[PDB]
Amino acid sequence: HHHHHHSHMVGDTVWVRRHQTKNLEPRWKGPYTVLLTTPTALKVDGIAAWIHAAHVKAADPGGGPSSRLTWRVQRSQNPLKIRLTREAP
Numbered sequence: 571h572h573h574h575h576h577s578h579m580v581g582d583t584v585w586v587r588r589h590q591t592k593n594l595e596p597r598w599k600g601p602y603t604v605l606l607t608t609p610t611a612l613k614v615d616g617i618a619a620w621i622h623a624a625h626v627k628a629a630d631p632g633g634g635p636s637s638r639l640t641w642r643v644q645r646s647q648n649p650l651k652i653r654l655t656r657e658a659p
Contacts, residue, residue, distance in 0.1 A: 577607040581640030583631035603640040
């Protein structure tokens with residue numbers, strides 16, 4: 571397949587904001603890597619196809635081999651764009 575659009579970079583360092591229905595608050599796990607974005611649904615490595623984006627939240631990789639260690643399918647800073655992270659040490 572060769573379907574492209576303005577998504578986030580393959581390797582977008584995020585967390586998955588999810589919790590079993592206990593009436594208790596949603597819990598993050600990470601660092602997950604978004605390969606493709608879709609309207610209100612993100613195609614992430616380790617996922618069946620898509621997670622509804624309310625159960626995902628962007629993270630700060632810090633740098634180096636954090637965001638970098640991902641499948642370089644469309645790793646190119648021109649078709650795929652991200653935005654300013656939180657900046658958290």
